[PDB]
């Protein structure tokens, strides 16, 4: 039973969330276009871009640290 918040392929949403949490910090406007190419390969029905960002806001400002949690290492 998928949660009410979900409204499309859960696998596609996880892909987008995984990239946002990467220390790369992809451009939301341009990164979404790259996701569309991924949807063609998996045939995922992506939600409207507005729905995605609105969902990102429920993650909380702390989620920003989740993206910047990138650990530094060089010594």
From Swiss-Prot:
Location(s) in or outside the cell: Host cytoplasm
Top-rank lineage group of the source organism: Viruses
Location of region: 1-gamma, viral genome ends binding: 3-75
Ranges of the DNA-binding region feature: 4-24
Note: This enzyme is structurally similar to and performs the same endonucleotidic reaction as retroviral integrases, RNase H, RuvC holliday resolvases and RAG proteins.
The protein's assembly and partners: Homotetramer. Part of the transpososome complex composed of a DDE-recombinase A tetramer synapsing the ends of the viral genome and the enhancer element. Interacts with target DNA activator B; this interaction brings DDE-recombinase A to the transposition target site. Interacts with host ClpX; this interaction remodels the transpososome for replication and is required for the flaps endonuclease activity of DDE-recombinase A.
Recorded domain comment: The catalytic domain contains two distinct activities, the cleavage and strand transfer activity and the flaps endonuclease activity. The N-terminal HTH Mu-type domain 1-alpha is responsible for sequence-specific DNA binding to the IAS. Two adjacent regions 1-beta and 1-gamma bind to the ends of the viral genome. Contains a D-x(n)-D-x(35)-E motif, named for the conserved glutamic acid and aspartic acid residues and the invariant 35 amino acid spacing between the second and third acidic residues. These residues coordinate the metal ions required for nucleophile activation. Each acidic residue of the D,D(35)E motif is independently essential for the 3'-processing and strand transfer activities.
Function: Responsible for viral genome integration into the host chromosome. During integration of the incoming virus, DDE-recombinase A cleaves both viral DNA ends and the resulting 3'-OH perform a nucleophilic attack of the host DNA. The 5' flanking DNA attached to the ends of the viral genome (flaps) are resected by the DDE-recombinase A endonuclease activity, with the help of host chaperone ClpX. The gaps created in the host chromosome by the viral genome insertion are repaired by the host primary machinery for double-strand break repair.
Protein name as it appears in the record: DDE-recombinase A
Source organism of this protein record: Escherichia phage Mu
Gene encoding the protein: A
Range covered out of full length: 174 to 247 of 663
